[PDB]
Amino acid sequence: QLTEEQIAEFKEAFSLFDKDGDGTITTKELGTVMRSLGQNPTEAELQDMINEVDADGNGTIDFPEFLTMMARKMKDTDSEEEIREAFRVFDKDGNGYISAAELRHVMTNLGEKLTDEEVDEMIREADIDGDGQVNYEEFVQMMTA
């Protein structure tokens, strides 16, 4: 399921964290690796993987084991890889919130025919908080309804 290009990218990342070159990373380095991949595992999920890949008590994680963990992560993606990536076309600055100005910029970039009032209304409809912006939770809720 993983492509050889994804595999080469993961090899570059792993080598960047396998600084001493022994072919393995330690079990505490793994948390940092995963957070540096732009992924957000819960400490529970992290500890689970930790104890699983280090069942033999050797502390070491080689590159095939890292790839296996990544494959299992790819299939266990909470089936929301589309909504996560669709959020990012609107959150231009990547700060975790879609602002009315950001939505306006997108709807003008992509040639959509909405007025600035229609854009404000998309925002106010999706913005359940009423804080003026759309967070990821609100975006997901709007999408799944």
Next chain:
Amino acid sequence: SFHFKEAWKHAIQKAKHMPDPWAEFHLEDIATERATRHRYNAVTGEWLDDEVLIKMASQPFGRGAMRECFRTKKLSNFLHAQQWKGASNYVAKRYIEPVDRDVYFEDVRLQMEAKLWGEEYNRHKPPKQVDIMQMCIIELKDRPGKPLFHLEHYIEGKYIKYNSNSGFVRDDNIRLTPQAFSHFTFERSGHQLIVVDIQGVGDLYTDPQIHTETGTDFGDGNLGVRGMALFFYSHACNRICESMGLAPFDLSPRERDAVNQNQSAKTILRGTEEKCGLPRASAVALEVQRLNALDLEKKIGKSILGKVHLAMVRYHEGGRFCEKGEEWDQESAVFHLEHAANLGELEAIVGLGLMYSQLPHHILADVSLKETEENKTKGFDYLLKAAEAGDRQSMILVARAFDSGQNLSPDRCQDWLEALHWYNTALEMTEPRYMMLAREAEMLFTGGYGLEKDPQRSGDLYTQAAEAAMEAMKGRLANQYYQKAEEAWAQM
């Protein structure tokens, strides 16, 4: 519950067909690097550091006067391919000449404070909302130097500078939103700061500058109240400023005409706009009301707006508002000096007092006003206000006015009781002391203008003047003063 889903999906699919605007630069072929990202939270005042993976071009694609720019890909999307192929494009910026590391962190602090101010502007329901791009720092630990870079997401579209931090405003089809935003930040912060240097794509702003009352934070771009003066010199209040209830800054007639002289169907209101408001109006009359309401202990120097008007005066005198072949506008300079003095800036009160009185003056030294009874009256009234507010020079001048009539208001007469009061007030402050004491002693010896003769007080004041002359090492003068004291006591 959501009657707008289909617009979202339209945009998502069109972004899906959209190509990566950086595809031909092939950043994905670059060797991945590891960096530490520092992000600032301006509500909590806290830094958060984490590790990121980046692919950065080896050569910059642009540079301003201060910073070089590098195309960069921040690597997410390791498990699933980039749907929109341009969501990981970032611009990294490095100072051309070496700087202290903390300049980078202070630039981030600036940008995020400006972002908070943009959110506050949006809370007042403007016709067009704004947003300041988030910016962070990446530190390349492995490279020699541990180089720091600013990092912002790439935004495609026409880049426009709407105003500068030095007074520039677009000399063409003006947009109302950036200027109204800057003015709003001046009012809503209570004149403590202003956000200018508005620039970017649409209303997605980046690299703003903040001018603050103190002038000390937010880098060398903080021009303090001089920056607010530069903004308000060129600012024309528009329908958005009015819709939010912003009061216009008091400009002179010539400045008013130049601002109206600088077309298109600009931005249109909707009716939801709320009134701004801590918040302070930008007009001198409303600020006079604010100072009157405040329980002042005869206090002055409490107006930031007055300091802005004073900075305007000094920019006028300095030739900042002059074109290359003209003479600088003295009329508007005096207009703004009047406004500064009526807002309690003691330098302005003293300067106008000296100027209207035909006395020498430092501020606006080369300006001369007509010798009129009105102007002489105004000059004395200003000098009296300055004396009542603690200025020793004005105290002595007012004393001599009530004494000899020199520079006295034509509405008033000589009065040696008042003159003695002001001489004494000046003498209590820690133009020589013995000279003023001897002048008092002489007035008591002679009497006149409401002051009856007092030989004993006159002798005592001559004695105090002689002792002060001894403290000044003027022994011969002390002997003359003692002779005058005995002469006065012999009158009895």
